[PDB]
Design a protein around this motif. Structure first.
Motif, PDB file in Angstrom:
ATOM      1  N   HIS A   1      20.490 -13.373 -55.291  1.00 54.98           N
ATOM      2  CA  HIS A   1      19.385 -13.422 -54.342  1.00 54.98           C
ATOM      3  C   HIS A   1      18.393 -14.540 -54.637  1.00 54.98           C
ATOM      4  CE1 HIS A   1      20.281  -9.854 -51.938  1.00 54.98           C
ATOM      5  NE2 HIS A   1      20.656  -9.260 -53.056  1.00 54.98           N
ATOM      6  N   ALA A   2      18.424 -15.116 -55.838  1.00 52.67           N
ATOM      7  CA  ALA A   2      17.718 -16.365 -56.087  1.00 52.67           C
ATOM      8  C   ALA A   2      18.553 -17.583 -55.723  1.00 52.67           C
ATOM      9  CB  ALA A   2      17.292 -16.458 -57.556  1.00 52.67           C
ATOM     10  N   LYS A   3      19.824 -17.368 -55.351  1.00 50.14           N
ATOM     11  CA  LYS A   3      20.783 -18.413 -54.968  1.00 50.14           C
ATOM     12  C   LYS A   3      20.969 -19.445 -56.080  1.00 50.14           C
ATOM     13  CE  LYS A   3      20.196 -17.875 -49.978  1.00 50.14           C
ATOM     14  NZ  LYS A   3      19.817 -18.520 -48.691  1.00 50.14           N
ATOM     15  N   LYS A   4      21.064 -18.959 -57.317  1.00 47.97           N
ATOM     16  CA  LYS A   4      21.298 -19.796 -58.483  1.00 47.97           C
ATOM     17  C   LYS A   4      22.428 -19.199 -59.310  1.00 47.97           C
ATOM     18  CE  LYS A   4      16.589 -21.629 -58.991  1.00 47.97           C
ATOM     19  NZ  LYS A   4      15.410 -21.743 -59.892  1.00 47.97           N
ATOM     20  N   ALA A   5      23.219 -20.076 -59.926  1.00 47.17           N
ATOM     21  CA  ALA A   5      24.345 -19.634 -60.738  1.00 47.17           C
ATOM     22  C   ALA A   5      23.931 -19.145 -62.119  1.00 47.17           C
ATOM     23  CB  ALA A   5      25.367 -20.764 -60.880  1.00 47.17           C
ATOM     24  N   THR A   6      22.710 -19.436 -62.556  1.00 43.98           N
ATOM     25  CA  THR A   6      22.250 -19.088 -63.891  1.00 43.98           C
ATOM     26  C   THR A   6      21.396 -17.824 -63.864  1.00 43.98           C
ATOM     27  OG1 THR A   6      20.286 -20.493 -63.705  1.00 43.98           O
ATOM     28  CG2 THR A   6      22.294 -21.499 -64.575  1.00 43.98           C
ATOM     29  N   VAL A   7      21.179 -17.265 -65.051  1.00 44.71           N
ATOM     30  CA  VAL A   7      20.311 -16.110 -65.244  1.00 44.71           C
ATOM     31  C   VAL A   7      19.073 -16.596 -65.984  1.00 44.71           C
ATOM     32  CG1 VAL A   7      20.046 -13.850 -66.308  1.00 44.71           C
ATOM     33  CG2 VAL A   7      22.216 -14.478 -65.228  1.00 44.71           C
ATOM     34  N   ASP A   8      17.934 -16.584 -65.298  1.00 44.92           N
ATOM     35  CA  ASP A   8      16.691 -17.072 -65.871  1.00 44.92           C
ATOM     36  C   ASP A   8      16.052 -16.006 -66.759  1.00 44.92           C
ATOM     37  OD1 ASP A   8      16.922 -19.540 -64.593  1.00 44.92           O
ATOM     38  OD2 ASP A   8      15.863 -18.832 -62.806  1.00 44.92           O
ATOM     39  N   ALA A   9      14.963 -16.396 -67.427  1.00 47.42           N
ATOM     40  CA  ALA A   9      14.166 -15.425 -68.167  1.00 47.42           C
ATOM     41  C   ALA A   9      13.424 -14.484 -67.226  1.00 47.42           C
ATOM     42  CB  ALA A   9      13.183 -16.141 -69.092  1.00 47.42           C
ATOM     43  N   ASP A  10      12.964 -15.000 -66.079  1.00 46.71           N
ATOM     44  CA  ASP A  10      12.275 -14.183 -65.080  1.00 46.71           C
ATOM     45  C   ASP A  10      13.193 -13.123 -64.481  1.00 46.71           C
ATOM     46  OD1 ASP A  10       9.711 -13.957 -63.343  1.00 46.71           O
ATOM     47  OD2 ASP A  10      11.309 -14.109 -61.846  1.00 46.71           O
ATOM     48  N   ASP A  11      14.502 -13.395 -64.452  1.00 43.36           N
ATOM     49  CA  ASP A  11      15.495 -12.391 -64.080  1.00 43.36           C
ATOM     50  C   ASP A  11      15.427 -11.191 -65.021  1.00 43.36           C
ATOM     51  OD1 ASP A  11      17.688 -11.042 -63.011  1.00 43.36           O
ATOM     52  OD2 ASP A  11      19.090 -12.695 -63.296  1.00 43.36           O
ATOM     53  N   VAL A  12      15.424 -11.460 -66.330  1.00 43.88           N
ATOM     54  CA  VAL A  12      15.267 -10.416 -67.342  1.00 43.88           C
ATOM     55  C   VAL A  12      13.917  -9.723 -67.195  1.00 43.88           C
ATOM     56  CG1 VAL A  12      15.204  -9.995 -69.844  1.00 43.88           C
ATOM     57  CG2 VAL A  12      16.852 -11.616 -68.884  1.00 43.88           C
ATOM     58  N   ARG A  13      12.871 -10.491 -66.857  1.00 45.83           N
ATOM     59  CA  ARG A  13      11.519  -9.939 -66.742  1.00 45.83           C
ATOM     60  C   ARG A  13      11.408  -8.927 -65.606  1.00 45.83           C
ATOM     61  NH1 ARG A  13      11.535 -11.744 -71.003  1.00 45.83           N
ATOM     62  NH2 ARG A  13      10.072 -13.199 -72.006  1.00 45.83           N
ATOM     63  N   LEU A  14      11.840  -9.296 -64.394  1.00 42.61           N
ATOM     64  CA  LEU A  14      11.688  -8.332 -63.310  1.00 42.61           C
ATOM     65  C   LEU A  14      12.734  -7.227 -63.398  1.00 42.61           C
ATOM     66  CD1 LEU A  14      12.630  -9.405 -59.651  1.00 42.61           C
ATOM     67  CD2 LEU A  14      13.916 -10.213 -61.590  1.00 42.61           C
ATOM     68  N   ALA A  15      13.879  -7.487 -64.047  1.00 40.07           N
ATOM     69  CA  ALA A  15      14.849  -6.424 -64.291  1.00 40.07           C
ATOM     70  C   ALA A  15      14.280  -5.352 -65.217  1.00 40.07           C
ATOM     71  CB  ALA A  15      16.135  -7.012 -64.872  1.00 40.07           C
ATOM     72  N   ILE A  16      13.608  -5.765 -66.297  1.00 44.04           N
ATOM     73  CA  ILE A  16      13.053  -4.754 -67.191  1.00 44.04           C
ATOM     74  C   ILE A  16      11.782  -4.142 -66.614  1.00 44.04           C
ATOM     75  CG2 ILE A  16      14.116  -5.796 -69.210  1.00 44.04           C
ATOM     76  CD1 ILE A  16      11.216  -6.718 -69.998  1.00 44.04           C
ATOM     77  N   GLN A  17      11.068  -4.847 -65.724  1.00 47.12           N
ATOM     78  CA  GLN A  17       9.957  -4.214 -65.011  1.00 47.12           C
ATOM     79  C   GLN A  17      10.449  -3.097 -64.096  1.00 47.12           C
ATOM     80  OE1 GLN A  17       7.090  -5.181 -66.898  1.00 47.12           O
ATOM     81  NE2 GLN A  17       6.188  -4.898 -64.863  1.00 47.12           N
ATOM     82  N   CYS A  18      11.525  -3.354 -63.347  1.00 47.37           N
ATOM     83  CA  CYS A  18      12.072  -2.336 -62.455  1.00 47.37           C
ATOM     84  C   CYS A  18      12.672  -1.170 -63.234  1.00 47.37           C
ATOM     85  CB  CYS A  18      13.106  -2.966 -61.525  1.00 47.37           C
ATOM     86  SG  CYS A  18      12.363  -4.162 -60.405  1.00 47.37           S
ATOM     87  N   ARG A  19      13.420  -1.459 -64.301  1.00 44.63           N
ATOM     88  CA  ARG A  19      14.020  -0.361 -65.047  1.00 44.63           C
ATOM     89  C   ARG A  19      13.047   0.312 -66.012  1.00 44.63           C
ATOM     90  NH1 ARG A  19      20.101  -0.758 -66.908  1.00 44.63           N
ATOM     91  NH2 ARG A  19      19.568   1.468 -66.998  1.00 44.63           N
TER      92      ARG A  19
END
Lengths: 74, 82, 89, 45, 61, 180, 71, 93, 104
Positions: free
Chosen positions: I48-66
């Motif tokens: 949904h960010a339309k990027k092939a990589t996993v950023d640090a912000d990906d980890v950030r909002l993932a752990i915020q949601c979980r």
């Protein structure tokens, strides 16, 4: 102030179950917890709009929170 | 002839395959105490039908590569709460 | 029976989506060529979806008192209700 | 994409013979994203 | 068709977004936010209908 | 009615009266197809009338594509002359029209599901498999395919009169099952 | 051999439809379906770069023959 | 070490259902996880029945309560009759 | 294998001694499956960010949601609000008969 009338709530309630002995304050507590759910959806939409680093809320962020919640089809 | 309430009446005749003491104990951990064993019969045979529907999905996907339950067969079985 | 039920069940029976647009969308999502049986299956499952939607919208409409033609709130209210019942994913 | 054939599908399930075109555009959207997510689930297996 | 109140909720959504960096929105999408909310209320109403069947307990059957 | 079924195909057979070397025919004639591992006959096309023949090694030949009997007889005579000009003593024995297909439009949609409910001893209908209705008429013995736009396809006749009689027979039933 | 299209008008025998007039594609697709449902009786009545049929060097176009053969 | 016997008996019941269905070989850890899924599903049925029945002033679980508990958790009850005629004259207790 | 040594280091950090190894191994397997659900969330927010990589912000909002999902806790501000609410009320009615104890 408020963002929802009592009219549409009671319309859906007596739409689904008209012949129910149902109390009033129950429905205002449901509206208050629903407005808290609105605030949760606003928080999730702000997070998923800060995801793409844009400044305009779109269909994909809402749809992904729905996939967390309902898995809609629009 | 309303066969569902007739089924609820004839629950007094059936004899399950799962031991009703074991189902009763696992319902004692789940807090359920029925002196009437017909509800125990119903819950046991429904859990059997749960396993039967899951293993039937595993059997219908087992024809796609005598029969073996696999992780490939476990994947459509995760549709409920996997 | 009535003439309008005749007209409505025949418009039920032979409604179907154009193969060109279903093929175009599936090839603009997959990115490869797809068989025509996939177009048949996808148009049939989509027709089942549309049917459930219109039926639930009629339920909404008549339970709201209002009369057809179905409004945007009716159809969208209906797909919503079909998601709420755990019946469409 | 479907605005003329889906109207003949909207009528066939109990709506009017001339429904609101707004609902026709919405229902076209329903169809497009329906096929989209169905395709995403289909490729995944 | 405007289930929630569109204007004050839209102002609050824009407020909380501008506090977190979101300038604008899209109008029918925010109506769709209202829309998923109103059947979050009907998910509560499906539970209400289940409790109404609980009110339909026939203990003299 | 003022609707006349227009012919779409007449299918014929003929016996050339001599055994044929299909490999020689495939190598010396142009626009010929021969693949014995898949299909044991020569597939040949000619343009006037736009027609297609299947040629057997035994000497019997089966013909497609004409919309009239004279065109089918002319085309079959032409493919026989292709066989003749390659050195084979071809004849033209026992010509016969074997099958006929026409099509037409009644200009109104038709209840197929009511038709299969009321004529279950003559029809069969499954929407997901095939959306058109198959109507197996006994007098004359004609198979019909009925569509929602009004197009009706009529097959199985040996003569034009069976097509015309089959459409004149089915048409008042279709008026009884009209949309209005 | 599946000659369901052969009654329907201008196929090769392989199953590819041709037409002077143009029928709908439901005819061709569902014709490949029609091979089972009862058309098979009339079928039994009626009976790529690497894909090209080899011919001799001096092969003649016999498509344009204008003569009449005997009855 | 004594609760494991009832787990093994549930494994025997799973093996009996597979004998009725006809499985030759099986991944063993899949059946251990499916017996865990059975025990969690039975506990979910029990918790659903209690949360449905504490809304009464009394405690007594009736058959209609358990039927509505299965319809809440997605079970079509009519085939239960057919399912018993599938199982109880074919699988020995 | 090595994961038993890692859990041994964890339980030595916990200071309490006696366990069972099957509990340890099921903790391992469910923990790695929660890790794979985090990785599935990383796939989703990379798509949904339309990027092939996993950023640090990906980890950030993932752990915020979980952390919003399965990391619940009672708020101390809400605790003080409920304290003011209930402790502001000072009612205690006493009746003669107290054998009855139900009003469902």
């Amino acid at each position: 102030n408020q963002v929802l009338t009592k009219k549409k709530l009671q319309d859906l309630v007596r739409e689904v179950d008209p012949n129910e002995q149902l109390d009033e304050d129950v429905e205002e507590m449901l509206l208050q917890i629903a407005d808290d759910f609105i605030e949760s959806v606003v928080t999730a939409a702000c997070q998923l709009a800060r995801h793409r680093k844009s400044s305009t809320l779109e269909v994909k962020d809402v749809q992904l929170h729905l996939e967390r919640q309902w898995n809609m089809w629009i | 002839s309303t066969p569902l309430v007739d089924f609820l009446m004839q629950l007094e005749d059936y004899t399950p395959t799962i031991p009703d003491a074991v189902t009763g104990y696992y319902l004692n951990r789940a807090g359920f105490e029925a002196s009437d064993p017909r509800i125990i019969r119903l819950i046991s045979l429904a859990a059997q039908k749960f396993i039967s529907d899951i293993a039937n999905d595993a059997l219908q996907h087992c024809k796609m590569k005598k029969y073996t339950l696999t992780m490939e067969d476990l994947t459509p079985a995760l549709s409920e709460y996997g | 029976f009535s003439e309008e039920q005749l007209n409505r069940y025949e418009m039920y029976r032979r409604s179907a989506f154009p193969k060109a647009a279903i093929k175009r969308l599936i090839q603009s999502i997959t990115g490869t060529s797809v068989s025509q049986n996939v177009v048949i299956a996808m148009s049939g499952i989509s027709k089942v979806f549309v049917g459930e939607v219109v039926e639930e919208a009629l339920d909404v409409c008549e339970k709201w008192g209002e009369m057809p033609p179905l409004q945007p709130k009716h159809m969208r209210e209906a797909v919503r209700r079909l998601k709420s019942k755990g019946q469409i994913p | 994409l479907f605005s003329k054939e889906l109207r003949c599908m909207m009528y066939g399930f109990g709506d009017d013979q001339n429904p609101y075109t707004e609902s026709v555009d919405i229902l076209e959207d329903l169809v497009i994203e329906f096929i989209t997510e169905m395709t995403h689930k289909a490729m995944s297996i | 068709e405007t289930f929630l109140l569109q204007a004050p909720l839209q102002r609050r959504i824009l407020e909380i977004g501008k506090k977190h960096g979101i300038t604008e929105l899209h109008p029918d999408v925010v109506s769709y936010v209202s829309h998923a909310t109103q059947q979050r209320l009907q998910n509560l109403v499906e539970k209400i209908s289940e409790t109404a069947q609980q009110k339909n307990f026939s203990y003299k059957d | 009615s003022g609707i006349v079924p227009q012919l779409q195909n007449i299918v014929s057979t003929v016996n050339l009266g001599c055994k044929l070397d299909l490999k020689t025919i495939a190598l010396r004639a142009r626009n010929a197809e021969y693949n014995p591992k898949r299909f044991a006959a020569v597939i040949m096309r000619i343009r006037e009338p736009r027609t297609t023949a299947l040629i057997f090694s035994s000497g019997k030949m089966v013909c497609t594509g004409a919309k009239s009997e004279e065109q089918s007889r002319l085309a079959a005579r032409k493919y026989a002359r292709v066989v003749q000009k390659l050195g084979f003593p071809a004849k033209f024995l026992d010509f016969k029209i074997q099958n006929m297909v026409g099509s037409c439009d009644v200009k109104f949609p038709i209840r197929l599901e009511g038709l299969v409910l009321t004529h279950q001893q003559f029809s069969s209908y499954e929407p997901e498999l095939f959306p058109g209705l198959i109507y197996r008429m006994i007098k004359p013995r004609i198979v019909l395919l009925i569509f929602v736009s009004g197009k009706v396809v009529l097959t199985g006749a040996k003569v034009r009169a069976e097509i015309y009689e089959a459409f004149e027979n089915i048409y008042p039933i279709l008026k009884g099952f009209r949309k209005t | 051999f599946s000659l369901a299209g052969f009654l329907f008008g201008n196929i090769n025998g392989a199953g590819q439809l041709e037409g002077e007039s143009v029928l709908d594609d439901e005819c061709k697709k569902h014709l490949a379906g029609l091979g089972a449902l009862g058309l098979g009786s009339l079928i039994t009545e009626l009976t790529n770069d690497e894909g090209w049929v080899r011919s001799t060097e001096d092969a003649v176009d016999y498509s344009d023959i204008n003569e009449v053969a005997e009855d | 070490m004594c609760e494991s016997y009832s787990r093994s008996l549930l494994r025997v019941s799973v093996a009996q259902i597979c004998q009725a269905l006809g499985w030759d070989s099986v991944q063993l850890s899949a059946c251990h996880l499916l017996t865990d899924v059975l025990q969690r599903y039975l506990q979910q049925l029990g918790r659903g029945c209690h949360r449905y029945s504490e809304l009464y002033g009394r405690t007594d679980p009736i058959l209609d309560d358990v039927g509505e508990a299965f319809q809440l958790m997605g079970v079509s009850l009519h085939e239960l009759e057919d399912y018993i005629h599938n199982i109880e004259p074919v699988t020995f207790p | 294998p090595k994961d038993a040594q890692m859990m041994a280091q964890i339980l030595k950090d916990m200071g309490i001694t006696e366990y069972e190894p099957r509990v340890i191994n099921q903790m391992l397997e469910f923990a790695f499956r929660y890790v794979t659900t985090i990785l599935d969330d990383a796939k989703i927010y990379s798509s949904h960010a339309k990027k092939a990589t996993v950023d640090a912000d990906d980890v950030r909002l993932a752990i915020q949601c979980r952390a919003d999902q399965s990391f619940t806790s009672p708020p101390p501000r809400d605790f003080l609000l409920d304290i003011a609410r209930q402790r502001n009320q000072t009612p205690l009615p006493l009746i003669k008969p107290x054998x009855x104890x139900x009003x469902x």
